[PDB]
Amino acid sequence: KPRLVLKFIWMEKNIGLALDQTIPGHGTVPLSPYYFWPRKDAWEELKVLLENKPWISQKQMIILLNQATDIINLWQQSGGNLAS
Amino acid sequence: PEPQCPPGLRQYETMAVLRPDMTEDERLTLTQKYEELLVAGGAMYVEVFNRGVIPLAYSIKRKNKAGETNNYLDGIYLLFTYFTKPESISPLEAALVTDDDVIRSSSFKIR
Amino acid sequence: SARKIPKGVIHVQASFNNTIVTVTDVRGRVVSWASAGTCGFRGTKRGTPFAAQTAAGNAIRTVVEQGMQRAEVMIKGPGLGRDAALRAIRRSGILLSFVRDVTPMPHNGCRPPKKRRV
Amino acid sequence: NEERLLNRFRREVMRAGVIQECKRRRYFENKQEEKKRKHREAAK
Amino acid sequence: SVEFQVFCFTNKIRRLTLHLELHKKDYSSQRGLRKTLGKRQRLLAYLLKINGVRYKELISKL
Amino acid sequence: PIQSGDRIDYRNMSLISRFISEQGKILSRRVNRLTLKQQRLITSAIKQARILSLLPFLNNEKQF
RNA sequence: ACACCAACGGCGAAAGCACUCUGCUGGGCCGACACUGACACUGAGAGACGAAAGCUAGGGGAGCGAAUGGGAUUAGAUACCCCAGUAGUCCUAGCCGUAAACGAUGGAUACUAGGCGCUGUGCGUAUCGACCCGUGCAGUGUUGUAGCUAACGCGUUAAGUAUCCC
């Protein structure tokens, strides 16, 4: 079981959260799924994809979700203000 | 060792949860009603072993005989890996509903 | 007055056309409630995020006789009144321990009524 | 505290869209195939 | 083996009938009883088609 | 994976609770990645353990 | 009444059937020759079952809700919207026997490319144990050759080629 990377991007309007996932005991190829500019859910889409995998351990899913959460959180604050 | 007797009749396993308070007449009297089952069943009645008391999820509604008092969070987890005729299981259900120290008794039929 | 303990639950009945911001202690004796119909305007205006913000602000501005530090919020229901209410409580910024949902999730209990066809 | 919202973000795990679903009437497989076909294809 | 089919279906109808008459509303096993009656009945017309005396013995046995 | 030879019963609370969420609800076959048979058998077993109050019917929501 | 499980999923002859457990009991599928030796198919009239609404008799009645009543919109509103709300909905014992009771496709057998699937079992590989690959069948689905079709399409589960029966 390889281990993992969320990649975020912040531009003022729009978050992207990108989940790159990895192999269980069964050889698999994930992408990085990038979740998108419209208000359509990023955390639900990401976490659900991970749960749908089961190929991801709980520690792995959670660490990536915590990082994802943190960025959505920073993003909400910057959007409500102007940080940039 | 268990597939010796099931030419003739069936195999079950009853899960029954208990009160958390009493430690006496709990291994004793419920084994005496297990002897009432022995008058009923009379087969390889073994492995009536006990499981430790742990906090369950949510339980209300003891229904004592005119008590209707106690909420619960804990319970002693008995399970009887018994073995009987398919006749007279409903009286085991009535015996494991009506008695006080047995609440929420679900029997099963392992294969 | 009250028991004078600065920890206590907050419930937000966010309806589909209203909000109610009530605040009560651990036992459940309410110390104040203030809704969108409480804070003045009433009609199609009530139940919008400005009504959630104003109703939450006028709800918990009157607990300064207590000055509750350890807040915890237990919201309920669908509507446009949740997120503005949480931004109002975080605007007052008191020690919000955890927000939570206690919405009734039925297990096919009663038949919900006719579809609207409007 | 910061102005981050994880209750909305966590809320879409088990969405409040099971409550906008349950306001209107119990109706059979025509609108359960519309809502649950669009929902079985929204998660795939 | 034919008379084990007729006799076996006869005990099938005995045990299923003393099931059904003290029960009275299972409308699923009614088809099982009627498929058994028809299946046995085509067997009895078969063995009657073959023989006389031997089918007379099948009647006299039950 | 995780079949582990021994059959799934309500007494086996190890592989069970890997299948429910912390919210306490049953996950589907395409998430848990089992066969249909494993899915139905843990379904009946999980609902049995739901009767014995080994598992909550609802877990109270939490933050922070 | 039974959320998530719920799946383009399983079962039933159809209607239907999902909270769990037990009891009785139907039906299906697969293997070995273990047995009988054509006992097969269809089926007039007949008989059974047959969603929902309906009716008789007795219970029960939380939600929903024909009729009804009030408010609104409206020129008007017996309607869509809203608030109350009776029969009904549920159960016992019956009657009724109709539905877009739809796959808009009666049943049965034999034969005629493939690809991608799912479900159940069987064999071999691999390990010696869960996998995993091919397969033998049965069932369920999706694209599709030939052929048919007025066309759309159907296409081994034919609307193909033939035979039988209503």
PDB file of C-alpha atoms in Angstrom, chain C residues 2-118:
ATOM      1  CA  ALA C   2     -30.569  31.397  35.904  1.00  0.00           C
ATOM      2  CA  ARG C   3     -28.212  28.712  37.237  1.00  0.00           C
ATOM      3  CA  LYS C   4     -25.264  30.960  36.175  1.00  0.00           C
ATOM      4  CA  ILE C   5     -23.125  28.414  34.359  1.00  0.00           C
ATOM      5  CA  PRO C   6     -21.354  29.693  31.220  1.00  0.00           C
ATOM      6  CA  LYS C   7     -21.677  26.445  29.271  1.00  0.00           C
ATOM      7  CA  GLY C   8     -24.891  25.646  27.446  1.00  0.00           C
ATOM      8  CA  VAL C   9     -26.432  24.257  24.279  1.00  0.00           C
ATOM      9  CA  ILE C  10     -27.793  26.337  21.416  1.00  0.00           C
ATOM     10  CA  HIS C  11     -30.466  24.957  19.115  1.00  0.00           C
ATOM     11  CA  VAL C  12     -31.167  26.432  15.686  1.00  0.00           C
ATOM     12  CA  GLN C  13     -34.494  25.331  14.215  1.00  0.00           C
ATOM     13  CA  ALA C  14     -33.623  26.274  10.654  1.00  0.00           C
ATOM     14  CA  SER C  15     -36.934  25.797   8.880  1.00  0.00           C
ATOM     15  CA  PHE C  16     -37.577  25.890   5.149  1.00  0.00           C
ATOM     16  CA  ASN C  17     -39.047  29.379   5.594  1.00  0.00           C
ATOM     17  CA  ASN C  18     -37.874  30.373   9.093  1.00  0.00           C
ATOM     18  CA  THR C  19     -35.197  30.153  11.702  1.00  0.00           C
ATOM     19  CA  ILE C  20     -35.379  29.889  15.472  1.00  0.00           C
ATOM     20  CA  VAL C  21     -32.300  30.506  17.575  1.00  0.00           C
ATOM     21  CA  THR C  22     -32.934  29.216  21.071  1.00  0.00           C
ATOM     22  CA  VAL C  23     -30.361  28.760  23.809  1.00  0.00           C
ATOM     23  CA  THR C  24     -30.756  26.584  26.870  1.00  0.00           C
ATOM     24  CA  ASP C  25     -28.795  24.943  29.641  1.00  0.00           C
ATOM     25  CA  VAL C  26     -27.771  21.316  30.054  1.00  0.00           C
ATOM     26  CA  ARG C  27     -31.042  20.278  31.692  1.00  0.00           C
ATOM     27  CA  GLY C  28     -33.166  22.095  29.150  1.00  0.00           C
ATOM     28  CA  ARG C  29     -34.639  25.187  30.752  1.00  0.00           C
ATOM     29  CA  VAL C  30     -34.451  27.850  28.067  1.00  0.00           C
ATOM     30  CA  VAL C  31     -32.556  31.003  28.943  1.00  0.00           C
ATOM     31  CA  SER C  32     -33.607  32.897  25.765  1.00  0.00           C
ATOM     32  CA  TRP C  33     -35.045  32.226  22.351  1.00  0.00           C
ATOM     33  CA  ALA C  34     -35.173  34.564  19.401  1.00  0.00           C
ATOM     34  CA  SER C  35     -36.406  33.724  15.933  1.00  0.00           C
ATOM     35  CA  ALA C  36     -36.784  35.479  12.623  1.00  0.00           C
ATOM     36  CA  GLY C  37     -40.316  36.416  13.587  1.00  0.00           C
ATOM     37  CA  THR C  38     -38.984  37.785  16.860  1.00  0.00           C
ATOM     38  CA  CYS C  39     -36.585  40.279  15.284  1.00  0.00           C
ATOM     39  CA  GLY C  40     -39.052  42.573  13.639  1.00  0.00           C
ATOM     40  CA  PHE C  41     -39.695  41.741  10.009  1.00  0.00           C
ATOM     41  CA  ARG C  42     -42.192  39.047   9.150  1.00  0.00           C
ATOM     42  CA  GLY C  43     -43.487  37.404   6.002  1.00  0.00           C
ATOM     43  CA  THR C  44     -41.530  36.348   2.944  1.00  0.00           C
ATOM     44  CA  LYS C  45     -38.475  38.128   4.353  1.00  0.00           C
ATOM     45  CA  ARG C  46     -38.152  35.898   7.396  1.00  0.00           C
ATOM     46  CA  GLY C  47     -36.137  32.762   6.831  1.00  0.00           C
ATOM     47  CA  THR C  48     -33.330  34.360   4.801  1.00  0.00           C
ATOM     48  CA  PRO C  49     -29.636  34.481   5.868  1.00  0.00           C
ATOM     49  CA  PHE C  50     -29.989  38.090   6.989  1.00  0.00           C
ATOM     50  CA  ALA C  51     -32.775  36.878   9.282  1.00  0.00           C
ATOM     51  CA  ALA C  52     -30.505  34.115  10.522  1.00  0.00           C
ATOM     52  CA  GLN C  53     -27.744  36.619  11.217  1.00  0.00           C
ATOM     53  CA  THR C  54     -30.010  39.165  12.908  1.00  0.00           C
ATOM     54  CA  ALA C  55     -32.011  36.539  14.796  1.00  0.00           C
ATOM     55  CA  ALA C  56     -28.858  34.846  16.048  1.00  0.00           C
ATOM     56  CA  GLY C  57     -27.283  38.166  16.993  1.00  0.00           C
ATOM     57  CA  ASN C  58     -30.354  39.371  18.864  1.00  0.00           C
ATOM     58  CA  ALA C  59     -30.611  35.909  20.383  1.00  0.00           C
ATOM     59  CA  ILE C  60     -27.152  35.610  21.919  1.00  0.00           C
ATOM     60  CA  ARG C  61     -26.582  39.305  22.533  1.00  0.00           C
ATOM     61  CA  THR C  62     -28.861  38.970  25.562  1.00  0.00           C
ATOM     62  CA  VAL C  63     -26.772  36.265  27.223  1.00  0.00           C
ATOM     63  CA  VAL C  64     -24.151  38.868  28.187  1.00  0.00           C
ATOM     64  CA  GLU C  65     -25.660  38.742  31.691  1.00  0.00           C
ATOM     65  CA  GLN C  66     -24.228  35.210  31.677  1.00  0.00           C
ATOM     66  CA  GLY C  67     -21.289  35.760  29.363  1.00  0.00           C
ATOM     67  CA  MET C  68     -21.172  32.134  28.286  1.00  0.00           C
ATOM     68  CA  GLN C  69     -17.721  30.953  27.319  1.00  0.00           C
ATOM     69  CA  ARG C  70     -18.163  27.315  26.373  1.00  0.00           C
ATOM     70  CA  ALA C  71     -20.742  27.284  23.605  1.00  0.00           C
ATOM     71  CA  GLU C  72     -22.021  24.264  21.728  1.00  0.00           C
ATOM     72  CA  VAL C  73     -24.612  24.453  18.982  1.00  0.00           C
ATOM     73  CA  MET C  74     -27.131  21.764  18.032  1.00  0.00           C
ATOM     74  CA  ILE C  75     -28.862  22.798  14.799  1.00  0.00           C
ATOM     75  CA  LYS C  76     -31.739  21.054  13.049  1.00  0.00           C
ATOM     76  CA  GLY C  77     -33.430  20.932   9.690  1.00  0.00           C
ATOM     77  CA  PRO C  78     -33.121  22.197   6.125  1.00  0.00           C
ATOM     78  CA  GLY C  79     -33.137  25.764   4.966  1.00  0.00           C
ATOM     79  CA  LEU C  80     -31.062  28.765   4.032  1.00  0.00           C
ATOM     80  CA  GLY C  81     -30.613  29.718   7.677  1.00  0.00           C
ATOM     81  CA  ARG C  82     -27.788  27.457   8.817  1.00  0.00           C
ATOM     82  CA  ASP C  83     -24.549  28.921   7.472  1.00  0.00           C
ATOM     83  CA  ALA C  84     -25.365  32.526   8.323  1.00  0.00           C
ATOM     84  CA  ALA C  85     -26.240  31.413  11.846  1.00  0.00           C
ATOM     85  CA  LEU C  86     -22.897  29.660  12.292  1.00  0.00           C
ATOM     86  CA  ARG C  87     -21.150  32.733  10.904  1.00  0.00           C
ATOM     87  CA  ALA C  88     -23.095  34.744  13.478  1.00  0.00           C
ATOM     88  CA  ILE C  89     -22.025  32.575  16.411  1.00  0.00           C
ATOM     89  CA  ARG C  90     -18.441  32.536  15.164  1.00  0.00           C
ATOM     90  CA  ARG C  91     -18.795  36.309  14.759  1.00  0.00           C
ATOM     91  CA  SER C  92     -19.601  36.498  18.461  1.00  0.00           C
ATOM     92  CA  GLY C  93     -16.690  34.081  18.663  1.00  0.00           C
ATOM     93  CA  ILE C  94     -17.441  32.564  22.074  1.00  0.00           C
ATOM     94  CA  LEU C  95     -15.928  29.152  22.835  1.00  0.00           C
ATOM     95  CA  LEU C  96     -17.949  27.138  20.346  1.00  0.00           C
ATOM     96  CA  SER C  97     -17.022  23.595  21.326  1.00  0.00           C
ATOM     97  CA  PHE C  98     -18.779  21.655  18.584  1.00  0.00           C
ATOM     98  CA  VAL C  99     -21.724  22.242  16.339  1.00  0.00           C
ATOM     99  CA  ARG C 100     -23.873  19.250  15.498  1.00  0.00           C
ATOM    100  CA  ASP C 101     -27.028  18.125  13.763  1.00  0.00           C
ATOM    101  CA  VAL C 102     -29.965  16.513  15.505  1.00  0.00           C
ATOM    102  CA  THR C 103     -32.340  16.576  12.529  1.00  0.00           C
ATOM    103  CA  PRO C 104     -35.084  13.955  12.467  1.00  0.00           C
ATOM    104  CA  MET C 105     -33.952  11.315  10.018  1.00  0.00           C
ATOM    105  CA  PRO C 106     -37.024   9.102   9.677  1.00  0.00           C
ATOM    106  CA  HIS C 107     -36.933   5.405   8.933  1.00  0.00           C
ATOM    107  CA  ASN C 108     -39.985   5.529   6.609  1.00  0.00           C
ATOM    108  CA  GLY C 109     -42.333   6.425   9.430  1.00  0.00           C
ATOM    109  CA  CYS C 110     -45.243   8.470   8.144  1.00  0.00           C
ATOM    110  CA  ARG C 111     -46.260   9.262   4.597  1.00  0.00           C
ATOM    111  CA  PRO C 112     -45.163  12.780   3.648  1.00  0.00           C
ATOM    112  CA  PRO C 113     -47.981  14.673   1.930  1.00  0.00           C
ATOM    113  CA  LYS C 114     -48.877  15.286  -1.765  1.00  0.00           C
ATOM    114  CA  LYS C 115     -46.446  16.703  -4.261  1.00  0.00           C
ATOM    115  CA  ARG C 116     -47.111  20.322  -4.981  1.00  0.00           C
ATOM    116  CA  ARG C 117     -47.585  20.458  -8.786  1.00  0.00           C
ATOM    117  CA  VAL C 118     -46.646  24.137  -8.717  1.00  0.00           C
TER     118      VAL C 118
END
